[model samples]
Target chain A: PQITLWKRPLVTIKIGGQLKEALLNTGADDTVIEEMSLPGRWKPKMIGGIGGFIKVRQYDQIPIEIAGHKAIGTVLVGPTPVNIIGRNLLTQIGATLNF
Target chain B: PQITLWKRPLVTIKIGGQLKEALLNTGADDTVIEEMSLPGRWKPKMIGGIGGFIKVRQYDQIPIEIAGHKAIGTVLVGPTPVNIIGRNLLTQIGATLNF
Candidate 1:
């Protein structure tokens, strides 16, 4: 599937048995989602973005489905304005940037 | 060109006669570059991201070349850790997200 950039490249994602919309962010190194409750052991971590850095809870080997593609990786829960599916998970789903 | 997510999708971009590497950020609404001197009348603006928001200078109708594709649009200059080629410019270059 190909998603044009004319609009925000957002896709429906299934995480922790919940559905959410998240942006496919090629520029981000890690996947960061808005604050959510997940049943797991997490560690405190910090991640930097375009603006600055923020503290987040890192949960590893979390199963997620993006645009119907299944992937399992590290997920960061933080105070992000939007949910982001970054390169870490993008790679697992065989997502790519094309022109 | 198709860029895999295994590595950062950084491309050489030419802006204001200067060459810089930028990430193709589908999650960003506006294109943002690191603090650079550009000759133009700019307006003060602010943009938010994963962490927070920051003050920036917005220069409109700025000519730029991304990966050899020519485009002119609004470019924001601010204290960004890395230059980002967002949807605003990615659309001009016909960039897309694919899986």
Candidate 2:
């Protein structure tokens, strides 16, 4: 699928048996999702963004389906305004930026 | 050009007659650049991201050349860790997300 940049590159994703919309972020280094409960032992970590740094829970080996593509990796849960699918999962799903 | 997610989609851009590298960010709603001097009457604006919100100066109708593609739009200047070419400019260059 090819998505134009005229609008936000938001896509449906299935995580933890829940469907949610997430933005495909090429500038972000890691995937960050809004606060959610996931069953696992997660480590406390901090990540930096456009503004500043924020603390989040890092859950590893989580499976997520993005627009019908399956990917498993570390996902950060924090107080983010929106869910973002970054380069980590984008690479697994073979997502690319084209012009 | 097609850029894989294995690496950051960083591209060279010419803005204000200076060359700089910027990331192609689909998650960001507006274009943000590091603190730089630009001639014009800019208004104070606030933008939020994964972390929080930050204050910036907004200059309108700024000409920028991204990967040989030209675009003129509002550009925000602030204390960003990296230069980001967001949806505002990406749309002008016809960039897209593909899988």
Candidate 3:
């Protein structure tokens, strides 16, 4: 399916049996989500982006659904201005730079 | 063609007789470039993202080629962490956030 970037490409994703809207961030390396409780052991870590760096919880093998596609991988939970779905998950969805 | 965000999705693009490699930033609203002189009338402006804001020179109708695709529209030039190809030009190239 085609996604428009006219605005930030915000999408509804299901994680930990909860629905959340996250920005599809091609610029980000990992999927960062706002603080939430999930069933997993997390490692304390820090992540950085265009803005700055922040401490987060890195949870592995977390299942998330993007546009109906299921993806399992690392998910970072922390205090972010917004939830961001990075390239890690975009690959699972076969995203590309079309021209 | 699919664009992988494994690392930063950096690509070589031609703008105003110069070849530049820029990051495909879905998180950005407008394309931004390092300070450069171009043949065009520009208006002083400012742009902000998750980080903060910066002053820029907004040049309209600037021609740019992204991955062999033609695009013409606003190109902001100023001090930026890196050159970013935003949705403005990406739309012209039929870019979509597929996943």
Please identify which of the two predictions, 2 or 3, would achieve the higher TM-score against the true structure. 2
Overall lDDT per candidate, in order of appearance: 0.92, 0.92, 0.82
Evaluated at residue B82, the lDDT of candidate 3 is: 81
Ranking by DockQ: 2, 1, 3
Q: Which residue pairs collide, candidate 2? A: none
lDDT of 3 by residue, A1-99 (tens): 778777778889999999999888787778889889978688898775444467889999999998788889889888877888888888877777554
What is candidate 1's lDDT per residue for A10-99, written digit by digit as tens? 899999899999989998899999989877899999899766888999999999999999999999999998999999999999988889
Tens digits of per-residue lDDT for model 3, B1-99: 677676789989899889999988887778999888888688988675544456788999999998888899999988777889998888888888764
In lDDT terms, which candidate is top?
2
Measured with DockQ on alpha carbons, how good is candidate 3?
A: 0.54
lDDT of 1 at A71: 98
lDDT of 2 at A64: 95
Give the TM-score (vs. native) of candidate 2.
0.97
Best model number under DockQ: 2
Against the native complex, each candidate's DockQ, computed on alpha carbons, is 0.88, 0.88, 0.54
**TM-score of model number 3:** 0.83
